[PDB]
Paper text:
A critical group of proteins that regulate apoptosis are the B-cell lymphoma-2 (Bcl-2) family and these proteins regulate intrinsic (mitochondrial-mediated) apoptosis. The sponge Geodia cydonium expresses a putative pro-survival Bcl-2 homolog, BHP2, that protects sponge tissue against apoptosis induced by heat-shock or tributylin (an organic tin derivative) exposure, as well as mammalian Hek-293 and NIH-3T3 cells against serum withdrawal or tributylin. To elucidate molecular mechanisms of apoptosis in these early lifeforms we have performed structural and binding studies on BHP2 and LB-Bak-2 from G. cydonium and L. baicalensis, respectively. We demonstrate that BHP2 shares the Bcl-2 fold with its higher organisms and, like them, bears a binding groove that binds the BH3-region of LB-Bak-2.
The structural basis for BH3 motif binding by BHP2, and its ability to discriminate against human pro-apoptotic Bcl-2 proteins over their sponge counterparts, was determined by solving the crystal structure of BHP2 bound to the LB-Bak-2 BH3 motif. Like other Bcl-2 orthologs BHP2 adopts a globular helical bundle fold comprising 8 α-helices, with helices 2–5 forming the canonical binding groove observed in all other pro-survival Bcl-2 family members. Clear and continuous electron density is observed for residues 18–38 and 67–198, with the intervening linker region being largely disordered except for a short helical turn formed by residues 53–57 that anchor the loop to the solvent exposed side of helix 6 from the main globular motif. Similar to pro-survival Bcl-2 proteins from higher organisms, BHP2 engages the LB-Bak-2 BH3 motif via the canonical Bcl-2 binding groove formed by α-helices 2–5. A total of 913 Å2 of solvent accessible surface is buried in the process. As expected, BHP2 Arg135BHP2 from the conserved BH1 motif forms an ionic interaction with the LB-Bak-2 Asp80Bak, an interaction conserved in almost all Bcl-2-BH3 motif interactions. Interestingly, Asp80Bak is also engaged in a second ionic interaction with His132BHP2, which in turn also contacts Asp83Bak, leading to the formation of a network of ionic interactions centering on LB-Bak-2 Asp80. A hallmark of pro-survival Bcl-2:pro-apoptotic BH3 motif interactions is the engagement of four highly conserved hydrophobic residues from the BH3 motif by the ligand binding groove of pro-survival Bcl-2.7 While BHP2 accommodates V71, L75 and V82, unexpectedly F78 is not captured by a hydrophobic pocket at the floor of the binding grove. Instead, the helical turn in LB-Bak-2 BH3 that features F78 is bulged out, allowing F78 to sit on top of BHP2 I94. This shift is enforced by the positioning of I94 in BHP2, where the protruding Ile side chain prevents access of LB-Bak-2 F78 into the typical position adopted in other pro-survival Bcl-2:BH3 motif complexes.
Residue numbers in the entry:
A (entry chain A): 14 to 37, 53 to 57, 67 to 198
B (entry chain D): 64 to 88
Write the structure that this text describes.
Amino acid sequence: GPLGSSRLYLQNTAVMEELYRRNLEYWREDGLSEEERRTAADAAERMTAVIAGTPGIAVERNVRDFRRGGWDVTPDNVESEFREVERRTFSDGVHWGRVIAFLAFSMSFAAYVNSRGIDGGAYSVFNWTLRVLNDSLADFIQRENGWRGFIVYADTLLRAQ
Amino acid sequence: ASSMASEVGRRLAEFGDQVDGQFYQ
């Protein structure tokens, strides 16, 4: 992938671990400087704040909506359901807002599929989402100064929220 | 895929746009 892919993989992993911990155990089954590990946690914290202040993508509210709609997810189609949400979310392009919204979705979706009794469901959702960051969004992330840049972006949002 | 998946993705695109608009004031 792009420049510094190896470090970004590890940092994307840390951001996801921190993000899912802060918002949701069931979704699971080094090489970083203490700097990069700290920037990952800070980014997951700001993003959690942005999500909570954005009712359209709030984690709990979306799990409630997925259940009310009877979203037909099974062990057989759950990846293709996830991939369709991914395709539509970024079909117009990629920016930090759609990244935040997609990651919020991925936590709501992981909780939802785990509530549907899909064994390994949330773990698979976590791993798919981590690899969207690694493989499809990496060029955007690095272009916008990585997770350090996200914190600058998110602070600006929270000032405005 | 389900209608729900396409509609969820579409709404994530739009809410993401609203989130990003706040960066530019």
